[PDB]
Structure 1
Amino acid sequence: TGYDLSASTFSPDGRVFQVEYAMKAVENSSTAIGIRCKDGVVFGVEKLVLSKLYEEGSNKRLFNVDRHVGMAVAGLLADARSLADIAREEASNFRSNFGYNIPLKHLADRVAMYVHAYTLYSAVRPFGCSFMLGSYSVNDGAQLYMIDPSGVSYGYWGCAIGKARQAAKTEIEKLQMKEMTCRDIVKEVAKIIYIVHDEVKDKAFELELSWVGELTNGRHEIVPKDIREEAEKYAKESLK
């Protein structure tokens, strides 16, 4: 019909269909969840292996846009890495100009505006990835924001992006995240990721775990392998 070929064209119902197609690109990817607990934020990713040939760590959907901010992506991994570099340069510029670590609210509001800059012109296409930025600090506290292809950044307690986003949100709502700590939230994130995974459909997934909280002194790091394996065992046992 011609109303969806460009992002600079409005539909007669006032909707930019290119942005919606970019959102569907995100909805076609595997589910990544993130839960903001009492003393940090925990990111979990159901990173499927498309073949046994890829090494353990390829296509890392958990990024480190700063020393205190982690990024969980879902959708086009090339656009995801481009946005990860954009966020990295935004945090670097914030540190080089103002002299301190960028607040998660400001980093989210800046990367979201960079994303929105690609939803107005026919010279470019909207980003085909949605990403969650999570951080923790003693002053600001645990923060978790999600940014979609349109550029809408919203703070969250528990969020999920991917094809099993609704089921993951339903499982997340059962949690009393506002009271429990990271050491339990990692186990629950593993349980949710294992629950929403579809073994008869695309199978053989890897659990990518990361966190940022007071137990890491406000530093985003990959969850240690021992804790990750304990969470994996708990998640497998929870499936009976």
Structure 2
Amino acid sequence: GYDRALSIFSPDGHIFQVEYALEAVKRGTCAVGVKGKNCVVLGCERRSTLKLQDTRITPSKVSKIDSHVVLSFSGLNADSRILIEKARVEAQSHRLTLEDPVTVEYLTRYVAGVQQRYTQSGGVRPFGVSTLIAGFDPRDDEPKLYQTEPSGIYSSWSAQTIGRNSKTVREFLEKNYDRKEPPATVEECVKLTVRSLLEVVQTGAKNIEITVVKPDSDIVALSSEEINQYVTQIEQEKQEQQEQDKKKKSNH
């Protein structure tokens, strides 16, 4: 067998359908999340194939769950649609029940709950979709960034890479970014999300999408010009680097 269903525990304590769901994620687009001290940047690789594709009418890879909680996603887009709709409906329901806006923790734990439920049954497979859920707490400033997996495990991570060739981005993110001292400014934060994505695109500022979430129900999605200005500043500091090695070699 023993990979033929979820109702087979397997002779190794692994659920193969959870394992193969994970393998599914890799096929989708790269996504990176980085917290500041007064922001979260939620950034994603934006796929291209043709210049006959619209961007006018077509969904972004980022979807507003409410108004202070946001979501980016990686995996099959088809699968993810249903994930995103449920996450949203519940976030509005939360104010039907309590009269509060949603907490960040409440939401991620719920979206993993919905997959976990699916995983538990044998009739239905779980979705092959990993999300990063970014947001700020109801009345407070304290940036929050969270991860979900198809298994139905959720975690907090300061910064995170998911999607295509996650590991190779991850290592770079680790080195430059610190837990001890995260980016000063929203501006500096965004550029760090750009460095990470630059690698995975090859060439581009047009296959890089940037969005920002800040406290107090502030979500803004940054214009394409401003991304072009940033990819060019990263290439300008990078050129300074090449040379600085040449100078150091001449001196010594």
**Aligned partners of 1:195 and 1:205: how far apart in 2?**
14
The one-character-per-residue Cα deviations of 1:129-180 (angstroms, maximum 9, x if unpaired) are 1100001245261100010111111111111111221121112111236242
Q: Which has the larger radius of gyration?
A: 2
CA separation of 1:6 and 1:95: change in aligned 2, threshold 3 A: same
The one-character-per-residue Cα deviations of 1:193-227 (angstroms, maximum 9, x if unpaired) are 0023346xxx896111111114xx33233124443
Task: List 4+ stretches of structure 1 deviating above 6 A.
Answer: none
Does 1:45 pair with 2:44?
yes
Gaps in structure 2 of 5+ consecutive residues: 240-252
The one-character-per-residue Cα deviations of 1:23-58 (angstroms, maximum 9, x if unpaired) are 101012221001011111101111121222211253
Match in the other structure for 1:36: 35
Asked if 2 retains the 8 angstrom alpha-carbon contact of 1:188 and 1:235, the reply is no
Match in the other structure for 1:108: 108
CA separation of 1:9 and 1:211: change in aligned 2, threshold 3 A: same
Task: Determine helix, strand or coil for the equivalent of 1:48.
Answer: coil
Match in the other structure for 2:244: none
Does 1:233 pair with 2:235?
no
Match in the other structure for 2:64: 64
Asked if 2 retains the 8 angstrom alpha-carbon contact of 1:6 and 1:121, the reply is no
Alignment of 1:1-240 (within 5 A): 2-56=1-55, 58-137=58-137, 138-139=139-140, 141-173=142-174, 174-176=176-178, 178-198=182-202, 206-214=207-215, 217-237=216-236, 240=239
Asked if 2 retains the 8 angstrom alpha-carbon contact of 1:36 and 1:158, the reply is yes
Kindly tell me the number of residue pairs found equivalent between the two proteins: 234
Asked if 1 retains the 8 angstrom alpha-carbon contact of 2:63 and 2:72, the reply is yes
RMSD of aligned alpha carbons: 2.1
Task: Determine helix, strand or coil for the equivalent of 2:86.
Answer: helix
CA separation of 1:211 and 1:204: change in aligned 2, threshold 3 A: closer
User: What TM-score results when the alignment is normalised by the length of structure 2?
Assistant: 0.85
Asked if 1 retains the 8 angstrom alpha-carbon contact of 2:76 and 2:129, the reply is yes
Gaps in structure 1 of 5+ consecutive residues: none
Amino acid aligned to 2:188: D
Offset, 1:236: 4.4
**Aligned partners of 1:190 and 1:65: how far apart in 2?**
23
The one-character-per-residue Cα deviations of 1:99-158 (angstroms, maximum 9, x if unpaired) are 111110010111110111111222111111110000124526110001011111111111
Identify the structure with the greater helix proportion: 2
Counting aligned pairs with the same residue, the percent is 29
CA separation of 1:70 and 1:11: change in aligned 2, threshold 3 A: same
Asked if 2 retains the 8 angstrom alpha-carbon contact of 1:145 and 1:154, the reply is yes
Task: Determine helix, strand or coil for the equivalent of 2:79.
Answer: helix
